[PDB]
């Protein structure tokens, strides 16, 4: 039945039920995701001219998201759910934005269909 | 040896070396992307209240990704390149953001390394 969400994304989550907020997490200060290691960038010759370009290697694993229990779920990046088919990681659906074009929420939850 | 690229996402791609663009793609109109279908919401009952949650399907082919030749390669989003292991995309690394903190240009491109 209920669960509780805990935000492993850099910033609040909170969704918008028009102007009203109807829920809101903390940023946890953990960040799930896919750690990288990014080279120095080599020359790639383009019709542009020589461009920087730099091979990101990525681990094995996903940093910073817990295991799965029962009645705790976890929001994360759109990126990180799209590459863990797991069915307890929700990501912002549907952004909110100020007239600065800043995000300060979004009007649902998205889960992958797997 | 020298490539051209074109870019399939939906702003233009400036490298910057300092101040000075040393290359810039512009946006082809195309998009490539993995096509979803969200649902219409269902409710999830939460600690925070009930949350509309949409569970995303995605397709199993890449839209606005053309295919592979000799001396052509790809800009895509960096959530594509993710998705997609070929060794013909590239993604805006090392973003440059104005004082608004609008992205107007990267200092790189990126490629997986697989």
Redesign the interface.
């Known amino acids: 039945?209920?669960?509780?969400?805990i935000n492993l994304t850099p910033h609040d989550v909170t969704?918008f039920d028009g102007d009203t907020p109807?829920?809101?997490?903390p940023a946890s200060g953990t960040f799930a995701r896919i750690m990288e290691d990014?080279?120095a960038?080599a020359p790639?010759?383009?019709?542009?001219?020589?461009?920087?370009?730099?091979?990101?290697?990525?681990a094995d694993t996903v940093d910073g998201l817990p295991g799965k229990v029962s009645g705790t779920a976890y929001l994360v990046s759109?990126?990180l759910a799209?590459?863990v088919p797991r069915d307890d990681l929700?990501f912002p659906?549907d952004e909110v934005r100020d007239a600065?074009?800043?995000i300060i929420g979004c009007?649902?939850?998205?889960?992958?269909?797997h």
Chains 1, 2 share one sequence.
Do not use: C, H, N
Request: aromatic share 12%; proline share 5%.
């Open positions: 039945a209920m669960a509780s969400l969704v109807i829920a809101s997490w990014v080279a960038p790639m010759d383009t019709d542009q001219g020589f461009v920087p370009v730099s091979q990101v290697r990525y759109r990126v799209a590459a929700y659906l600065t074009g800043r009007r649902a939850l998205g889960q992958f269909d």
